[PDB]
Symmetry: D2
Subunit: 455 residues, 4 copies
Amino acid sequence: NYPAEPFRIKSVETVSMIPRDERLKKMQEAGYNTFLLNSKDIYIDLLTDSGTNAMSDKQWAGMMMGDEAYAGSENFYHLERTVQELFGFKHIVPTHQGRGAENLLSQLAIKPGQYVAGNMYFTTTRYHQEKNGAVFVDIVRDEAHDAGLNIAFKGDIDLKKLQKLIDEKGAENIAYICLAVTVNLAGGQPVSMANMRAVRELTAAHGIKVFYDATRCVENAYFIKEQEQGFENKSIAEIVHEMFSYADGCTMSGKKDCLVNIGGFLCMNDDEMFSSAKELVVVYEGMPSYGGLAGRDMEAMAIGLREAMQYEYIEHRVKQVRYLGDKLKAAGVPIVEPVGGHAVFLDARRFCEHLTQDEFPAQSLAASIYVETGVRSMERGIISAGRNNVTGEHHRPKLETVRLTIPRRVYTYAHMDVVADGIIKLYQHKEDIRGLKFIYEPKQLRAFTARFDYI
Amino acid sequence: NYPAEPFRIKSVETVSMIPRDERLKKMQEAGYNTFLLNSKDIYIDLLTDSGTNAMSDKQWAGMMMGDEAYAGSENFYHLERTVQELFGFKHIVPTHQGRGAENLLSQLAIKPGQYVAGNMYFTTTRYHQEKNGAVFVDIVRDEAHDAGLNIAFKGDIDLKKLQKLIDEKGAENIAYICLAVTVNLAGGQPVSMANMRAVRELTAAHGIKVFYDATRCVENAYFIKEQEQGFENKSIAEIVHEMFSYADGCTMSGKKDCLVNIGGFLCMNDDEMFSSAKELVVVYEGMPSYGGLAGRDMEAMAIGLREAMQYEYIEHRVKQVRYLGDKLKAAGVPIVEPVGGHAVFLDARRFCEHLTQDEFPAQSLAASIYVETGVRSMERGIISAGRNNVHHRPKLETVRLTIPRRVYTYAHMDVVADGIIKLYQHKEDIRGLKFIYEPKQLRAFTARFDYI
Amino acid sequence: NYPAEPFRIKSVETVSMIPRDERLKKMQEAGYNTFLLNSKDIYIDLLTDSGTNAMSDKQWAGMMMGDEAYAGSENFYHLERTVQELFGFKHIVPTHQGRGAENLLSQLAIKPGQYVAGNMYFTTTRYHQEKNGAVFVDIVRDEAHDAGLNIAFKGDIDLKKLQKLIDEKGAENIAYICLAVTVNLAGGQPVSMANMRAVRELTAAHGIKVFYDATRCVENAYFIKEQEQGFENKSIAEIVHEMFSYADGCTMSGKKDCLVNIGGFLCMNDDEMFSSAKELVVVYEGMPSYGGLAGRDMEAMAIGLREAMQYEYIEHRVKQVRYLGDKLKAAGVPIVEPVGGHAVFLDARRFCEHLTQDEFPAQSLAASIYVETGVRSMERGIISAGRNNVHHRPKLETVRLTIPRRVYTYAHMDVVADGIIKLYQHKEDIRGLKFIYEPKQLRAFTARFDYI
Amino acid sequence: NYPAEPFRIKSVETVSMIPRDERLKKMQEAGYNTFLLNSKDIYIDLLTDSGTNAMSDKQWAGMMMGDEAYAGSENFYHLERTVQELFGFKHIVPTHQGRGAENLLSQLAIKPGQYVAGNMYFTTTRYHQEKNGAVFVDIVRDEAHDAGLNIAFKGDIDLKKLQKLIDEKGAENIAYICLAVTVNLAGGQPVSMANMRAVRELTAAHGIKVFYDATRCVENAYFIKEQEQGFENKSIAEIVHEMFSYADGCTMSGKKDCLVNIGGFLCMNDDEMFSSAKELVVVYEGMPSYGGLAGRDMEAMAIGLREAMQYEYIEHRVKQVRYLGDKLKAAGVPIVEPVGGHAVFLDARRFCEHLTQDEFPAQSLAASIYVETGVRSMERGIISAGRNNVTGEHHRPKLETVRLTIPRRVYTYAHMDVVADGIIKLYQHKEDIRGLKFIYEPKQLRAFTARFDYI
Ligand SMILES: CC1=C(O)/C(=C\N=C(/Cc2ccc(O)c(F)c2)C(=O)O)C(COP(=O)(O)O)=CN1
Ligand SMILES: CC1=C(O)/C(=C\N=C(/Cc2ccc(O)c(F)c2)C(=O)O)C(COP(=O)(O)O)=CN1
Ligand SMILES: CC1=C(O)/C(=C\N=C(/Cc2ccc(O)c(F)c2)C(=O)O)C(COP(=O)(O)O)=CN1
Ligand SMILES: CC1=C(O)/C(=C\N=C(/Cc2ccc(O)c(F)c2)C(=O)O)C(COP(=O)(O)O)=CN1
Ligand SMILES: [K+]
Ligand SMILES: [K+]
Ligand SMILES: [K+]
Ligand SMILES: [K+]
């Protein structure tokens, strides 16, 4: 079932164990917005798995060996050869994080008016595509839009949608296919190796490029080894290397599956695009030999990427998240299924049936979760959806969820029990959860700074 | 039930997940002596809680602020002021670890021929006492020698035994009383504040000194807050400060309850003895301003001692050990009771009743534990007792599962428990061992065995 | 004369002492382009002072206290409060380095077609201005373009040039004034407080904004305390705080005067622009609570900015650079004068007068410097200028010896000086180079050359 | 002449630049005893080269890889194989520092009544020898007792003194020969390889053991490569390995030439003595696999010992000390000659001719040095000599010196100029230096806690 941590604790991080009454005052000061809580006032911070990972002793040893030179740093050569060895790509350009690499790729591979198609989208990835004159097309399988359907590899590309897009618009008007592993918007759902092979075969026949969003590719590789027939004898590294053999490049956020707190990079095989990438990286990030990263951070990301290939680490990572999802599902708590690689999504629509969506149930549930447990979670519903600015009304998503995002190697099963036991107790008196109303609302991105109050 | 860790993991330590077949080869290469296993071949190392603790980010920040000066280091001033504030003693002398402080105290407070009495003994403490011409006398309560008797504060000194020693030998022939908190040999058993208060009252009436072995005094302070009536409203620091108010000094191994990997110190209130301590520390340890420790380590120990005062930390520390003991007891595994603050002791006498004591049951059980789970434990039976005469047979024949602080999780405890529980269901298959290396002095450290 | 380092060495960095014959092979392998040399093959790396600084023990202690949370990190609150205290600005937005802040400001304060005027330009700053539809206008004093003229505060804006721009184009067509302290392209030349005060008076009368390039503002503050009458009794922090009182905001590269290896930020007083900055930072850098930086790096930058305010540190920093410039000038080596705060610029035009500009004298001099001494320097002549049309010929043809902060000693400066002085005594032997790789965009970074 | 530092500064240590008037108040608070000054009030601390060294980035990387296990630590195996490789000894026992190893050796190789002979003595080494029932015999060459005689290898053993001791007392009554490299009491003077060969040849013919005090053996090895004919082509490691080939064991203080802040070890080739050494180390230091050291510190000492073998490091170390001595000698400042490997000794007798020794000129000179420059130095004269307690009078040494001890890789030539320029200015008005009188004097070891005042 659930394996113990395949590591020992080397060093601990001090936290404040403030009681419920103080936590309530902190939440009121934050305007009932978990995004406005201070880190020092949080016991278990499940806001995101991005850049919040715990590094290893080996990584911290590399942090002491930072070659901080502006050009020719040994740390960059270590990072370069590691990615070339594990991912198999020809050229590497480091960036300070994932959206820095997406900014580069979108300016290099998109002519204004072309289409970009992928298995759903991410906010920063789709922004840089649309800012550079592209029109996004969702070609994910229809099953990915059913929150309750428990099936494997929900993130697979629908080959029928891809075939019709090529026929309706033409291969010349398609910039590239953006295949994300895993699919964050669908709940961290993986993509099968068979799907990546079929996508590569169909795109190569029309000369269409394929670039991966490899942000959580290691979690995706474990799902292949666990659930895809024929990969039970292959190591995590062998699966990762085959995944990228069906891609012409990738954007990577090291802050996720590279087990670091900062860092990313951009990969490609084309020499001419790599030449243009080195010219553009100096504008936004830095030299091609550090790309907005300190030398010690390139070293940490190179070591972390190699550590992520260990089967026992990634098995425990995914199964720790699954443990939280299983404990909630066994108690009757409504969650999004299947459980993804990095987070558990509570269905706040069913959790707070007594509240309309205009009362922000996911935002109110997140506030109650913190006060009752000291756990910070992220609202992923109507507040994060924003406002259509042409009309001013709320964007209303089908998913009204609270995201419990698990950083890597930071928490234990006992911490997961604290999260579960508190949510389960809340669910047993879920009728007492009250709604919220705006008291402060910003112009753009309201999820980060809006303030509320009980109705 | 059992609280979650009152901290987050900041950094992790890489371990080798070698399978059982590899572990079997490793144990054979080590000659079935867990003391001879390589650290790199161990998943969960429960050999000792001494110096194996995980430090905090605050402590590691202090590690970057090491003032390595030979005299007048700010790190020493931080350590001195911390101990004076929390322990209440007047003078502090740092030592590289606990037995360095015992060497100093034993040469300063023992006249040849005098008696030293305490609630049981420890190997290093008793050696320096006997090396300096003292005869040890155990004045612990008799119940502390019964592994299965579940009573509170097993480490208390028997006041009747202390009164008889004063009458039979005279107060002039008693060097001092050595009160250890907790009592490691009895299984990490605590001493009540009433016992410390009663001991202070009896010794002061005869002019007899009292020095504490404060190695695990914070674990002792939690047991007082949990189980002694009247201390439920008092903080850990208040209890620690009151504990040492009944002592004339103490020896401390920071490698335990100070949450560090090296370090100790010696405390006292007497000015004249403190003067002699500073003259003797330069012979063995170093200057009184660092005492065999780097500046960064004095800083780490000062910060760790203050972190140990946090109620949530020390509550979780003790209850993680109790979780392992409860899970084993619920399956029928014979252990020493009650569970101490730092370790769970398997009763190898009852675990291997089908084996004679000359068959090294505790040593064979520890070897079997590693092969089955990759967990290293310490033999604490006849092998550790040794042979003065041509075997010493102690009443306690145990295997110690010693838990380092802030290093392992409940899931790691489940690995230990589930493997031992499976081993106990086939305890008839655990065979004895045979001597292969002469027991030169401390045989527990270097002896080799075999049976196949 | 020249003060000793106002600090001790805490830790050292290993270097490779390869002989001249090895360096000659390394330079040939690099194609005589210093930008292509490996760090491991360099003794003294004077390529840039950006991100190459040595941090303090205090900063490394903060590196252990990284609060890596996505929002509400204590490290961000420390950085924000530090900048608000020392710079006096109302709002802070962290960025991963300086050009990240310039990308934000250029999209927020530039309407397409407007003019941006400043005391010369920098490559990354001018790109983001021109990419956002601005036309750059240099309003620095004419003396700043003369490498040999030794006058104080060469970076001052010519108020007459600024007045003519306002009259010829109109204040409505001027986006803002970009005042850099110091002026990197002129050789690290400072700007006087009187000039900043006079600029603020003229721009405010027409409603024109003023934004600083504060990358080396601490070096600029020292020159004011040293050479501007009336500031001899004022501390570095007081001067820095007054400098920014004449600005509406600033872009800062922490990799320079904040004594860190990564990091920057964007400051402003206007609430509405700060709201737009937080919406745009999530697109390129990250959340406004970390802005593309790890928590430990925000903490390191906050501590480094406060360390930069120490008079003894910044005095030694500038005077170590001046020591290198004085030793070269005393031997007759042609340099840019006066010596700036962060680098010494060899005048390759005068150093290699026997060589034409199309022969790449600055590039060939930098290659010869490495082979003779193992010192890497940066070409800052026609190669860095590039070719828009089918070569750009700048008035300054220099080789930059850029000094990282707290990394090297006076003895390292003697190695640089003694080797260049020996090279200058045989400057007739320095030969030209020939293009081998097409100058695709920024040719200074990847072009290769040869002559034998 | 003097080479630049063969390294870059990776990190700096903050110091307080307090002015002269404040420094005077600090010195008065310290009772004019530099031993009582606070570290935070000192610019350049030349009190000792013991444990004050700056570590490298490689060492600090090892500090992140500490295997803190009680037995079988990988760090101990690294340290063990390093010493066996570089020193050539068969068995290694770590100790927390040098005097911990001397405590072990003195209890293992000395029967009560035997003699111990060596090239002068050190305080802690001679104490453990005499505490275990030995009688010390100085067999150094007579030239070592002339402070002004500038000759090479002053620390050599006088073979005539050794031959007469064997004849007058018998080989059975000689515990061992304690050969120290370098000789700290003579001013850091080295021992020639020819002397070590002759000592080994003479002792081996009588079955007498030889144990080295290798505390500063790397500095000693450089002097051999620089000044002993025939070793110009041999590396530092080759010279070190040959030095210990003439010894049966050694005591080592890693706090010196191992480039660490704590640590030591004990070496020997005899299996039976090593067996007894492991039994005795558990009493005083700890297990034979850590010996009173954290795992990270065994790793740092192993890395530092290997770093010390680099010719450029040790050449700069010795020549930085020589630079300070040369600048003082060129200005006419009286110093002890020749300059040793680790310190420059000012001749306070000639520096303060207007003061009698009962006025503590070396102590008063050290106080003036700090007030004028912010440099702490050590008194090495009548105060450190102590009091013959049978009579109560002062011990009066021939040497009345102030020791300027240089930690490794901590200071620059510009720091040496601060020391020199301040002492040179003091020497130009040396008649203004006043004497001191006891106001507080302890029973034993007065150099550490005594307080004074101007006469
Ligand atoms: C599948 C994919 C991502 O998941 C992703 C990031 N994810 C994080 C951070 C995040 C992003 C945007 C928000 O509004 C947000 F509140 C949190 C998250 O929490 O989900 C990026 C971007 O990579 P950078 O973050 O290294 O630039 C690219 N691709
Ligand atoms: C109550 C007390 C201790 O428990 C103790 C040590 N504890 C050890 C380490 C150990 C000691 C001796 C052994 O034969 C042994 F096999 C294990 C242990 O595992 O329990 C010391 C000594 O403190 P030092 O270790 O800091 O010097 C003093 N007092
Ligand atoms: C006055 C100013 C700078 O000097 C500066 C950078 N300085 C560099 C690095 C550099 C930059 C561009 C090059 O083509 C180059 F070859 C070297 C340098 O060496 O001088 C930046 C940008 O700050 P970022 O580097 O933190 O983004 C803004 N303003
Ligand atoms: C030739 C030799 C040494 O020089 C030596 C130490 N020397 C230091 C420290 C010191 C020693 C005694 C003092 O009263 C003193 F004030 C300073 C010094 O400053 O000279 C040791 C001892 O090695 P530990 O210091 O690692 O135990 C053994 N052998
Ligand atoms: K850097
Ligand atoms: K030290
Ligand atoms: K982070
Ligand atoms: K340890």
